[PDB]
Design a protein around this nucleic acid. Structure first.
Lengths: 49, 71, 49, 71
DNA sequence: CCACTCACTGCGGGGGGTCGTAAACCACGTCTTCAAGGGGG
DNA sequence: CCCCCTTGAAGACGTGGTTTACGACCCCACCGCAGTGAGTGG
């Protein structure tokens, strides 16, 4: 517990620095593509609906 | 606590001064004549660089600088 | 006194350590010379034509 | 400190207005002027008064100045 | 021949003797305004 | 209680003559990571 906090903070800092400059700038874009969303099942158990 | 290289070069300048003012007809070796010039250059460098500010400037202060260490 | 800079006139040219020792070396890459030879020449250990 | 010194100066200006015209120029020339500091004798010839008369006039004028300021 | 390491490096958590100048003055002095008092309840 | 003196001196500001004093110069016979580099052998 005493030692994991520094690693957590370092990872958070790296994520913030890499992702800091992304901002929603447009209402809509003319794309039509996307991704396929399906439930995930592992070992016969529906993990997420 | 001063760098050894800086002290050596200060003495080298003093050695050149003694060489320029050497009289061969006296008969003494240059080693004994130049010992006063070399140690004079080293002493002046220590006074100006021992601290960030010069510690001894006047005549009386310079005498006490090298004597209070032993006294 | 927070804004005024001075300057020092150098008796002989000196190399900037950032453009020498920060890998990759800019001086070495520009001259197409090994860094060790440049270091030897700079610190008065050998000659260069 | 700037606020405190500014409100005290305005009291001096208001007090000086209550003084008579001759006394105002006596205080202003000797005490308020920066380029020149008018002495007792110089103000004497300009208004045809005695050297002591200029000196004696300031005491009464300053009492009026203090009275207005203290009130 | 260019393949395929591996050791290497760097990145994060000591004397005396003269001289010139901005200090460093004690006398220097005459100036100011210190003024004793002068009269109009 | 306005006015011009008096009349004796207290300090006021230099001041560079006079005089110290500072400062300087002269001689002295862990942690895992990744990019680098030779360094082969072929």
């Amino acid at each position: 517990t005493a030692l994991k906090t520094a690693n957590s903070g370092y990872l958070t800092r790296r994520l913030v620095d890499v992702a800091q400059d992304l901002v929603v700038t447009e209402d809509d874009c003319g794309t039509h593509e996307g991704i396929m969303m399906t439930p995930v099942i592992e070992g016969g158990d529906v993990k997420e609906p | 606590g001063l760098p050894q290289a800086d002290l050596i070069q200060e003495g080298n300048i003093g050695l050149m001064k003694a060489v320029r003012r050497f009289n061969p007809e006296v008969g003494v070796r240059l080693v004994s004549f130049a010992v006063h010039w070399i140690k004079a250059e080293i002493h002046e460098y220590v006074l100006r660089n021992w601290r960030i500010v010069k510690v001894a400037t006047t005549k009386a202060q310079r005498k006490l600088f090298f004597n209070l260490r032993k006294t | 006194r927070r804004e005024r800079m001075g300057h020092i006139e150098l008796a002989s040219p000196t190399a900037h350590i950032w453009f020498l020792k920060s890998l990759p070396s800019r001086i070495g890459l520009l001259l197409d010379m090994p860094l060790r030879d440049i270091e030897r020449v700079l610190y008065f250990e050998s000659y260069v034509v | 400190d700037d606020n405190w010194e500014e409100q005290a100066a305005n009291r001096l200006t208001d007090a000086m207005q209550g003084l008579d015209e001759r006394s105002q120029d006596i205080i202003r020339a000797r005490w308020l002027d920066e380029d020149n500091k008018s002495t007792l004798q110089e103000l004497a010839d300009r208004y045809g008064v005695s050297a002591e008369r200029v000196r004696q006039l300031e005491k009464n004028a300053m009492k009026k100045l203090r009275a207005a300021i203290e009130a």
